Amino acid sequence: LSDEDFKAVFGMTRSAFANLPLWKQXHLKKEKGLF
Amino acid sequence: LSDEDFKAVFGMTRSAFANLPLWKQXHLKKEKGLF
Amino acid sequence: LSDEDFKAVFGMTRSAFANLPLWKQXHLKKEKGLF
Amino acid sequence: LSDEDFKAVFGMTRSAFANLPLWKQXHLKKEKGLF
Numbered sequence: 001l002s003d004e005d006f007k008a009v010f011g012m013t014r015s016a017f018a019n020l021p022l023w024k025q026x027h028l029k030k031e032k033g034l035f
Numbered sequence: 036l037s038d039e040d041f042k043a044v045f046g047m048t049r050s051a052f053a054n055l056p057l058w059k060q061x062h063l064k065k066e067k068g069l070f
Numbered sequence: 071l072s073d074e075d076f077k078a079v080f081g082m083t084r085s086a087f088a089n090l091p092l093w094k095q096x097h098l099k100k101e102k103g104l105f
Numbered sequence: 106l107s108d109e110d111f112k113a114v115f116g117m118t119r120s121a122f123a124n125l126p127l128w129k130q131x132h133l134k135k136e137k138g139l140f
Contacts, residue, residue: 023061
């Protein structure tokens with residue numbers, strides 16, 4: 001994803017996302033239809 | 036937890052829980068604050 | 071349900087709902103026909 | 106890691122992990138700081 005699209009999809013910075021638990025980073029990608 | 040307490044806490048049998056993705060079985064355990 | 075529609079149906083966010091005891095989260099879903 | 110801790114963290118069983126290439130099993134450990 002572009003920076004703009006990552007923001008649009010997840011609503012947080014890449015750094016914040018990378019700090020979430022691994023289960024949640026699973027959940028969010030599934031919730032947003034990315035894999 | 037005993038099987039009966041597991042049902043009371045998670046709202047499903049262990050066999051059903053086992054058929055959830057491992058990231059979801061992460062989510063639910065964390066939502067209940069348990070193991 | 072979307073977070074938007076969840077709040078419209080249950081009168082609270084998923085975060086708040088997740089804090090209710092399971093028997094009550096039973097009650098509410100059964101009362102709305104969404105079990 | 107115990108098998109239980111492994112599958113909770115990696116989101117897959119040790120058996121599932123073993124299916125992946127050796128360089129990928131490198132990536133998946135190092136991504137979590139677990140090598």
